Amino acid sequence: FATNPFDQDVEKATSEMNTAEDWGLILDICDKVGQSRTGPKDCLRSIMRRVNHKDPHVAMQALTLLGACVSNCGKIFHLEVCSRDFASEVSNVLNKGHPKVCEKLKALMVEWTDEFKNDPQLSLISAMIKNLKEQGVTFP
Numbered sequence: 001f002a003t004n005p006f007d008q009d010v011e012k013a014t015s016e017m018n019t020a021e022d023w024g025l026i027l028d029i030c031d032k033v034g035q036s037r038t039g040p041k042d043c044l045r046s047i048m049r050r051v052n053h054k055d056p057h058v059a060m061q062a063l064t065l066l067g068a069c070v071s072n073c074g075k076i077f078h079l080e081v082c083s084r085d086f087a088s089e090v091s092n093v094l095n096k097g098h099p100k101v102c103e104k105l106k107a108l109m110v111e112w113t114d115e116f117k118n119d120p121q122l123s124l125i126s127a128m129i130k131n132l133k134e135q136g137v138t139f140p
Contacts, residue, residue, distance in 0.1 A: 006032070006046035014050045014061035021061035029065065030072040040080040043069065048089045051105070056098040063104045070112060078116065082124035090128060094137065106139050 006029065013025035033039040047069065050062035069077050080086070090109075094102050109125055116122035129139055 004042055004046045006043045010043070010046040010050055010062075010065065013065055014053075014058055016055050016058050018061065021064045026065055026068050027072075030069060033069065033073050033077065040073065040077045044077070044080045044086070048086075051089070051093055051101070056101055059098065059101045060104060063101065063108065067108050067111075070108070070115075078112075078119075078122055081112070082116075082122050087124065087128050091132070094132070106137070110139055
């Protein structure tokens with residue numbers, strides 16, 4: 001019965017009508033995440049639904065929103081991204097996704113492992129990279 005409070009803003013920020021992702025709507029999303037206990041998880045789940053959209057223009061906009069949340073929301077968001085739920089969502093996107101979408105998601109992962117390298121609680125992204133490399137996936 002419950003609706004995700006991020007769904008509406010995430011849709012406008014990543015609309016197919018947009019020439020590019022709306023940054024004003026991105027920063028408002030980042031600020032909103034930090035206002036509630038469930039903000040990080042609610043937002044990440046909403047983002048991943050848009051990353052899974054049929055139109056790659058929508059999926060590309062969603063990945064820049066994902067990157068902005070990891071950049072601006074701090075450890076609380078990094079912990080959400082460091083989950084089995086995200087790892088499942090990553091392999092589901094890489095197996096069905098457009099090459100342009102796969103390129104961007106894998107690029108973000110390489111950036112995150114470098115950013116998370118000094119935190120042992122944030123090792124999951126590096127573990128996902130190693131696991132995907134065993135399956136023959138390349139990470140430039």
